[PDB]
Nucleic acid binder design. Structure first.
Length: 1346
RNA sequence: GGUCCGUGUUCUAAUUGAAGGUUUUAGAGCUAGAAAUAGCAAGUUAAAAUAAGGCUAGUCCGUUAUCAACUUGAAAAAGUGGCACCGAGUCGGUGCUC
RNA sequence: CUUCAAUUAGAACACGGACC
């Protein structure tokens, strides 16, 4: 009952836990059941798992939420214009807005008249005939001096502000091809002085305005420059600028091809591979090639009048008509049978389907391309297709490229056009123009009043905000200053005050000063610097020299004042690593010593650095600089702006003057100065028990208390829901086993993040070698997962050790060879593996490949290296063979590369555990480690698992994850127990760092595995195996009881320590718990479904009708609930007791949670139970008679609640025939297992029986079950390896959660869906604690109302 | 090897501006036919909504994080489940402590 | 409910300089 070990299998989806004894075993306790079930007590084996859905990234939120701002800010300019325009709108027509706002409702509910534009039938059609789309009306105002009807002005300007086009252009609009093409060559010619270009003569506008296909257009420009072919670099530079996909593989002498698109998302990424191969050059020639390309894009939409956009938009439109009317005739004449579907069917992707139907321009367009070819005369309209310019809708996705300047001008023109006629229009021109120019800046964020957490803004004055007065009512300095401060860490040492980058310098001088010990000649004993000695030292030496030397100290100070002719300084280097530099920064510029030595200004001089450190805009500094101008000149001011300070310093200011030592009355900074004869360090000042500082800190630095300190970390939020829940598992254990602080604890995090590489790495190598062995014997893509078949082609069909051409059929005789032996490091990597007829020929075993083979065939190895068949490491190691002995550190690197991960995540949680569990401290100011927190790397965990015949199959059961929690658990222990000598490098505590030499031993294998120096070999797993295949072809054993020599403790006995493991995993019951989670998400799927008359559709708002206005559907419901109460059934509304589940749409939780009963009543339920119901998140575990279990689903929906248990004998089989090749490694170890592969056709039948019995028992998908059994019979005759993996997939109908679709050769078995929740209320129900060992079980057939 | 510093790159946490997908209507459809239905005509755009909605009425906030169950506790957060062995189809039994 | 862009924070890769 005393000494236990526990380990983990951290996972993004999985959380595995086990409870071993210190001797390796699982216990078998009995625990009680909560509820009203005749199952009082239960027997649980200690290990179990907890699975979950992973933690979400706030990006999903982020896109919906910022958008909710614009979607309401959009109408915040729309609302804004009405009011300036509200006054005279009333006189022209009383109801125009009160007719606009009501455009959705059908006329009868809708206010006023169904024609919003005019309210009268005749005129609205009259408008649509002069101007069908608004660009017609948009330009008409710009063209016509004649005053138009006011209403027309309003509608015209709405389409301007709502769709202003991006602000990505910073200024007033220099953007023609003409200006931004000559910058691509003036820098390209700047890029290449020699090898120049001519730019005077070239015309770009006439060549690059043209809508004609790009392919001729890129060709078209080169003929205007004889120098560069289209492949030629410049010629590709434009190709990118055109938006095509050009390849810089030829362009520079680059092995790896580079296809880049200006257009694509990844362009940034792909190109940044290139600027990393070119060195940081040509960011100009590619940005201006984007400038150009972007100055290319706009000219598509500018094809004399003032409104170019309008003109251009009309041009597409009449073009839309000319070709459209042109077209109908050809179908109706040449092949008229397809006119039927083209124009009428919105589902067909015919034209009608493009214009109103869901099909996007792409879908319609792709549909048209084969059609054209059959018709005659088509190709000219097809010319518009290649452009993709044919029959354009005005509003589309490419409309995404406008800047706000293009919209502005016609607005500003439109204003100029009608201002004279509506007087109030010209005076709000300024204001109205400002509605467009306004941009909520990035650095101001939102604009709250401080009642929402996100806004950081501060308002100089308080009044309702407008875009007109935005600049008057906002401190830019505080919107901006705040922006950086929130995201800048406060001190690592004081979390309650921002870090520095004067004080820190004022501190740093004094801190180093304290430890100086001076001995004049007289001094009998070396004494510290006296306090007054400091103030004399600060005044002169540090306020006149940047770095002050030891020689300065003697000469400047010791001779002059104290007349220590000779003297010794023993505390410090010659020149002080600290300095009064920021001080010295100001004397050069402000040049008023008496101003800085002054103490009063110390608050200001510090106030001023932050205000400098924060701002990155030279202008911006001015914003908060001005207040202090009335104290100095302007020429200092212009001298002042320039200087900049950054960096976030190690210390806080409220440590320095905020705390006080209540007894002594001295701050730490006050204390460093003048500490009396016993000067003391600042790090001596943190732990001094006489002083209030260690105890004043303790109240501060725990104010935060765990949802808080872990979400302080950084990384994927998927594992954040791991770590928070992983810790949560840990404490439930001490409840499972009596609040006991354990001996050791093992953690591991598996890594989060191939058939085609294998065939691109062979093709370029028989091409630069030039050989014909690729043309002598041919292969495929899906065959090179065979390492014997993939090590013939990396050695060019010639031996790697013997230089005979390799046979091509009998590879089962040739032998796998790791270059460096498996007793040093265990390598299945591609590079270490070499194929030869004979494993040994690489020479002596204990050594790496023999020195004799390096003299003969070194060159052949070097020969391949140039063809990228083998990595550099592969070659590098075989010269080490030639070189001689792998370094002790190379050996020592093998451990460090085996020893510990580098992911910081495995570190900052092990402090949490240190902090979390090792609460107790000793009375000597140190930390007790009764719990040794072990950090493992999975490959070691995995390799042993694979090394010693225990498999992981993800497909069969979640047991594999929970084992990994166990398997981790044992190994962390057995390491701190056999080698307590390396505890520092992996466990989270200060410990002993000796690795390089002791583990190294020379020449001792037989009594050197017992010396102080534990292991001559590098491999850390060797002792567990009874013997290690001593390198190549020789074998050396390991003593059967393995134990650390020093421990005098059986770290390991080979005979039986495994017997626990093999039998432990054999444990039939592992706890399996699915965290019930209150559901989260949107009220419904975002799509607005057509008008229909089905109840399920959700009204878009309270007024709206689903039966008439459609909207949402498939509403999602956070917790299902169980209720008993009578309901009305029979037109006489007779009372009838019932029992039926219900799903509570997260939409209705707010209505439900506060007042469940009333929400129950509005639904029509009556005689509501008082506090009988259960709140169940999804994933609730049911239990039925016969062991059937079920997991919660919302309506007549249920998934599998029963897991599959499997015997071990069957698991080790199933992966040997899964991995029939790529086993490689040791052939002899392979073959004794290989006998087994065809040896036991029988055990799978028992499996086939093991497999089948579960389906009749639990899932009762009796109609689905039958099909799968037949399919094995289809392939039953076939050899086992191929069949064996076909039944691995078939567990996915037997694997947890809902039935899935799963392949079986050409036979596919659809997923099974359960349509009714009715069955589980008769059943027993479950409530699972997070450990799942404890239970709350409610018999559900007792609670009912007749 | 470490620190710090520049830059570029990607990803994750926040801010801002742009283009959409969609639903209702406005967009009168016209020729012949009892009508149903044949034949032609036109089609691009515009408003309003983009989670219901809530109070603090903000140019706010609403899809992140958190949740086994019980006893409290308004919530947070504390408290609630015998041991030593034999063994295994999801856990049995055994016997000690109760 | 897709996409694109501005600004800042952190983590992982390439290059240069300063210190140990």
């Amino acid at each position: 009952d005393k000494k236990y070990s526990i380990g983990l299998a951290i996972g993004t989806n999985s959380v595995g836990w086990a409870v071993i004894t210190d001797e390796y075993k699982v216990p078998s306790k009995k625990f009680k059941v909560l509820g009203n079930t005749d199952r009082h007590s239960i027997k649980k084996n200690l290990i179990g798992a907890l699975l979950f859905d992973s933690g979400e990234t706030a990006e999903a939120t982020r896109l919906k939420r910022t958008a909710r701002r614009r979607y309401t800010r959009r109408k915040n300019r729309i609302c804004y214009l009405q009011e300036i325009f509200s006054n005279e709108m009333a006189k022209v027509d009383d109801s125009f807005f009160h007719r606009l706002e009501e455009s959705f409702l059908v006329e009868e509910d809708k206010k006023h008249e169904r024609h919003p534009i005019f309210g009268n039938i005749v005129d609205e059609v009259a408008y649509h005939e002069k101007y069908p789309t608004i660009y017609h009306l948009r330009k008409k105002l710009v063209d016509s001096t004649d005053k138009a009807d006011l209403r027309l002005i309003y509608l015209a300007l709405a389409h301007m502000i709502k769709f202003r086009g991006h602000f990505l252009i910073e200024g007033d609009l220099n953007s023609d091809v003409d200006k931004l093409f000559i910058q691509l060559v003036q820098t390209y010619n700047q890029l290449f002085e020699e090898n120049p270009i001519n730019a005077s003569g070239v015309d770009a506008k006439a060549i690059l305005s043209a809508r004609l296909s790009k392919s001729r257009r890129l060709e078209n420009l080169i003929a205007q420059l004889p120098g560069e072919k289209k492949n030629g670099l410049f010629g590709n530079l434009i190709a990118l600028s055109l938006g095509l996909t050009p390849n810089f593989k030829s362009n520079f002498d680059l092995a790896e091809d580079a296809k880049l698109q200006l257009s694509k998302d990844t362009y940034d990424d792909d190109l940044d591979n290139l600027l990393a191969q070119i060195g940081d050059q040509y960011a100009d020639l590619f940005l201006a090639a984007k400038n150009l390309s972007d100055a290319i894009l706009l000219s598509d939409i500018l094809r004399i009048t003032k409104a170019p956009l309008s003109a251009s938009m009309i041009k597409r439109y009449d073009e839309h008509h000319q070709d459209l009317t042109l077209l109908k005739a050809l179908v109706r004449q040449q092949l008229p049978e397809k006119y039927k579907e083209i124009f009428f069917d919105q589902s067909k992707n015919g034209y009608a389907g493009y214009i109103d139907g869901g099909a996007s321009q792409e879908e319609f367009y792709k549909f048209i391309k084969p059609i054209l070819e059959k018709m005659d005369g088509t190709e000219e309209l097809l010319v518009k297709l290649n452009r993709e310019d044919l029959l354009r809708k005005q509003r589309t996705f490419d409309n995404g490229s406008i800047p706000h300047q293009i919209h502005l001008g016609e607005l500003h023109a439109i204003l100029r056009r009608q201002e004279d006629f509506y007087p109030f229009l010209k005076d709000n021109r300024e204001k109205i123009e400002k509605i467009l120019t306004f941009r909520i800046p990035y650095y101001v964020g939102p604009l709250a009043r401080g009642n929402s957490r996100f806004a950081w803004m501060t308002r100089k004055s308080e009044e309702t905000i407008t875009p007109w007065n935005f600049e008057e009512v906002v401190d830019k300095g505080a919107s901006a200053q705040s922006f950086i401060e929130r995201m800048t860490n406060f001190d690592k040492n004081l979390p309650n005050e921002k870090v520095l980058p004067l004080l820190y310098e004022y501190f740093t001088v004094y801190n180093e000063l304290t430890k100086v010990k001076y001995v004049t000649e007289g001094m009998r004993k070396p004494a510290f610097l006296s306090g007054e000695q400091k103030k004399a030292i600060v005044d002169l030496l540090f306020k006149t020299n940047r770095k002050v030397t030891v020689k300065q100290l003697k000469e400047d100070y010791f001779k002059k004042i104290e007349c220590f002719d000779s003297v010794e300084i023993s505390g410090v280097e010659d020149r002080f690593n600290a300095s009064l530099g920021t001080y010295h920064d100001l004397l050069k510029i402000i040049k008023d010593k008496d101003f800085l030595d002054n103490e009063e200004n110390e608050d200001i001089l510090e106030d001023i650095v932050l205000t400098l450190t924060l701002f990155e805009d030279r202008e911006m500094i001015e914003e908060r600089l001005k207040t202090y101008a009335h104290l100095f000149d302007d020429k200092v001011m212009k001298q002042l702006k320039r200087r900049r300070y950054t960096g976030w310093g190690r210390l806080s200011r409220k440590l320095i003057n905020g705390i006080r030592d209540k007894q002594s009355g001295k701050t730490i900074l006050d204390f460093l100065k003048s500490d009396g004869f016993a000067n003391r360090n600042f790090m001596q000042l943190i732990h001094d028990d006489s002083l209030t500082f260690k105890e004043d800190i303790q109240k501060a630095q725990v104010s935060g208390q765990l949802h808080e300190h872990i979400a302080n970390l950084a990384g994927s939020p998927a594992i954040k829901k791991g770590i928070l829940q992983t810790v949560k598992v840990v404490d439930e254990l001490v409840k499972v086993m009596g609040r006991h602080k354990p001996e050791n604890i093992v953690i591991e995090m598996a890594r989060e993040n191939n058939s085609r590489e294998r065939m691109k790495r062979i093709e370029e190598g028989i091409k630069e070698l030039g050989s014909q062995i690729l043309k002598e014997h041919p292969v495929e893509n899906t065959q090179l997962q065979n390492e014997k078949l993939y090590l013939y082609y990396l050695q060019n069909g010639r031996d790697m050790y013997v230089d005979q051409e390799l046979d091509i059929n009998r590879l089962s005789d040739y032998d796998v060879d790791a270059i460096v032996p498996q007793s040093f490091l265990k390598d299945d990597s591609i590079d270490n593996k070499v194929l030869t007829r004979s494993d040994k020929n690489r020479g002596k075993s204990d050594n790496v490949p023999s020195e004799e083979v390096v003299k003969k065939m070194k060159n052949y190895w070097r020969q391949l290296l140039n063809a990228k068949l083998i990595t550099q490491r592969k070659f590098d190691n075989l010269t080490k063979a030639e070189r001689g002995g792998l370094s002790e550190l190379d050996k020592a690197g093998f451990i460090k590369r085996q020893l510990v991960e580098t992911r910081q995540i495995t570190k900052h949680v092990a402090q949490i555990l240190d902090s979390r569990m090792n609460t107790k401290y000793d009375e000597n100011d140190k930390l007790i480690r009764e719990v040794k927190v072990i950090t493992l790397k999975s490959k070691l965990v995995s390799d042993f698992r694979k090394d010693f015949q225990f498999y992981k199959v993800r497909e069969i059961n979640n047991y594999h994850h929970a084992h990994d929690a166990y398997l981790n658990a044992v190994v962390g222990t057995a390491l701190i127990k056999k080698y307590p000598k390396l505890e520092s490098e992996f466990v989270y505590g200060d410990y002993k760092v000796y690795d390089v030499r002791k583990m190294i031993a020379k020449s001792e294998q037989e009594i050197g595995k017992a010396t102080a120096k534990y292991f001559f070999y590098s491999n850390i797993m060797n002792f567990f195996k009874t013997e290690i295949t001593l390198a190549n072809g020789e074998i050396r054993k390991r003593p059967l009881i393995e134990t650390n020599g020093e421990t005098g403790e059986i770290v390991w006995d080979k005979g039986r320590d495994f017997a626990t493991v093999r039998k432990v995993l054999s444990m039939p019951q592992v706890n399996i718990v699915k965290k019930t989670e209150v559901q989260t998400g949107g009220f419904s799927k975002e799509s607005i479904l057509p008008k229909r008359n089905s109840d399920k559709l959700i009204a878009r708002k309270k007024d709206w009708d689903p039966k008439k206005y459609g909207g949402f559907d498939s509403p999602t419901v956070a917790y299902s609930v169980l209720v008993v109460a009578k309901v009305e059934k029979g037109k006489s509304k007779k009372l009838k007791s019932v029992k039926e589940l219900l799903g509570i749409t997260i939409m209705e939780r707010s209505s439900f949670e506060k007042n469940p009963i009333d929400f129950l009543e509005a639904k029509g339920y009556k005689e509501v139970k008082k506090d009988l119901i259960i709140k169940l998140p999804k994933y609730s575990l049911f239990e039925l008679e016969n062991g059937r279990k079920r997991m919660l689903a919302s309506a007549g929906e249920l998934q599998k609640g029963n897991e599959l248990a499997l015997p071990s004998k069957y698991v080790n089989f199933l992966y040997l025939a899964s991995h029939y090749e790529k086993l490689k490694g040791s052939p002899e170890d392979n073959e004794q297992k290989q006998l087994f592969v065809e040896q036991h056709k029988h055990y799978l039948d028992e499996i086939i029986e093991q497999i089948s019995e579960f389906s009749k028992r639990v899932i009762l998908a009796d109609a689905n079950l039958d099909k799968v059994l037949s399919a094995y019979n289809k392939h039953r005759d076939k050899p086992i390896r191929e069949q064996a993996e076909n039944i691995i997939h078939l567990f996915t109908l037997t694997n947890l959660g809902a039935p899935a679709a799963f392949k079986y050769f050409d036979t596919t078995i659809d997923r099974k869906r359960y349509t009714s929740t009715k069955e589980v209320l008769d059943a027993t129900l479950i409530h699972q604690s997070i450990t799942g060992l404890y239970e709350t079980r409610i018999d559900l057939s007792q609670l009912g109302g007749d």
